[PDB]
Amino acid sequence: TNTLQVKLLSKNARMPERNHKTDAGYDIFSAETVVLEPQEKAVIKTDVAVSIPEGYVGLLTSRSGVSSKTHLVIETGKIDAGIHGNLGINIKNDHEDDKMQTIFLRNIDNEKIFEKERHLYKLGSYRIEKGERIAQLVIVPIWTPELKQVEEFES
Amino acid sequence: TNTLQVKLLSKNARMPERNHKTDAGYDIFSAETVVLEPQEKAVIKTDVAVSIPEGYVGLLTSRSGVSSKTHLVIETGKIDAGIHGNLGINIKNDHEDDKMQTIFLRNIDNEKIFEKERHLYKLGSYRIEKGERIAQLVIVPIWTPELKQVEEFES
Amino acid sequence: TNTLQVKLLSKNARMPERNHKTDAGYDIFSAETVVLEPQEKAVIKTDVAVSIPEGYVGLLTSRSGVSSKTHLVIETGKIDAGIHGNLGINIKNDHEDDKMQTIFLRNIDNEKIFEKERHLYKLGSYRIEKGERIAQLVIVPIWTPELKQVEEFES
Ligand code: NI
Ligand code: NI
Ligand code: NI
Ligand code: NI
């Protein structure tokens, strides 16, 4: 009634946390380092499993800060009571492929990351780190009626 | 209380179905064949009508499989109690227009469809078939308070 | 119980309104004129503040008409009980940058706006006006359980 079952699949997974008694969602962390070049799609593994009860739906959705600063687009996933296992972040680096090159990757804050080893990246590329806040989980009550076909509507 | 009114506008419409007693959503099928080239927007007709009651909101949203595999982006529609009639899938083929050509279209599983008649398509194009699972419907309770203007907030 | 606290930060802000007793959402208006060229991201200020209670989450999401007609993509924001202040519309002009030019901007209805003063714009650019319906607010009950780590799931 007042508890949610959470399972960690690997050592690299972090426990989802509710920062404040007013923060409606739960912070979801990445369990792998992914380099996403322009227009690239990926399903980023969190290595976290949830057992949501019946009559409820989970919303694995993007953070307001990351989505506004970066070209990283997270398609909101619907977490049912039936689907157990590794939760994937449905993501796409929506930055355009302009065929231009740069020597800097960008973090989830759109800031240039200065690495010691010099490499050539395609412009607009992003990098996501381990245990990094990229998405959040939102559980909302869901209404299930048994639908019947009608020729016309009434009240 | 435990029933939803569903209307089929044409012979090409399919009845929305809840596969399992745990599947929180209802599978929504396409009622037309649409070829979407890169960057193209469309409102795909389902020929299905719903009569959602007051205090509830419908969410016509993308499937996890289709949205992760293909460049097809479905903007989640909000189905009110007032709007009756043909439900449209707000979609966009988000694949970039690179001016390149191919002889293969791609299905909702991103697989190459091998057609007998040879044709030239623009690279990144998709095709959606009749009675094909592209989206799903999610009904959630909605809270309506009568808002009042205040100069400062209190409790 | 049946009231929502709404605050207007400036003279350019408009009060969110529920048109009909069946319209599940509240119309959100822009408080500034923004010209968005292809691929450009912005946080459009509404100058409106809300005090959503605990156990509820706000959904600042796009309108069905605007999102289907224009290349303007609004990333749905989650409005918590803790975050008070100016609500920002997380937007991106998803139109491709084809390096082509036109002398017409486009409104939220994708129509060409004919201005007296002749100017050169980049093709696919949009303009948003003051007190213009671009987004809507949807408040949904949110379930908060205290999560506990388990090795395996049970019932
Ligand atoms: Ni959503
Ligand atoms: Ni795009
Ligand atoms: Ni949504
Ligand atoms: Ni949403």
Elucidation technique? X-ray
| Pairing label, strands C26-29, A41-45 | unpaired
Resolution (A): 3.1
Sequential DSSP letters for chain B: ----EEEE-STT----B--STT--SEEEE-SS-EEE-TT-EEEEE--EEEEPPTTEEEEEEE-HHHHHHSSEEEPPEEE-SS--S--EEEEEE-----S-EES-EE-TTSPEE--SS---EETT-EEE-TT-EEEEEEEEE------EE-SS---
Chain A environment of B21 (Cβ under 8 Å): 54
Q: Which of B25, B51, B62 sits opposite A75 (nearest CB)?
A: B62
* Interchain contact, C62 vs B80, CB within 8 Å: no
CA C50–ligand 2 middle distance (angstroms)? 31
Residue B56: its chain C contacts at CB < 8 A? Answer: 24
Q: Any idea which residue has 């426990």 for tokens?
A: A15
Q: How far is A115 from A104, CA to CA, in rounded Å?
A: 8
User: Token pair for residue C8?
Assistant: 């207007």
CA–CA gap between residue B7 and residue A144 (Å, rounded): 17
In a 3-state reduction of DSSP, which class is residue C127?
strand
C101 is in an annotated binding site: no
Q: What domains are defined for chain B? A: 1-155 (2.70.40.10)
Distance CA A97, CA B63 (A): 26
Residue C22 CB-density burial (10 A; 0-12 exposed, 13-18 middle, 19+ buried) = middle
Of B68, B136, B140, the CB nearest to A41: B68
What distance in Å separates the CA atoms of residue C48 and residue C14, rounded to the nearest whole number? Answer: 8
Give chain B positions within 8 Å (CB) of C16.
147
Nearest Cα to Cα of residue C60 among C28, C93, C104: C28
The token pair at A11 is 């050592």
Chains in contact with B, where contact means 3 or more Cβ–Cβ distances below 8 Å, are A, C
In angstroms, rounded to a whole number, what is the distance separating the alpha carbons of residues B60 and A54?
Answer: 20
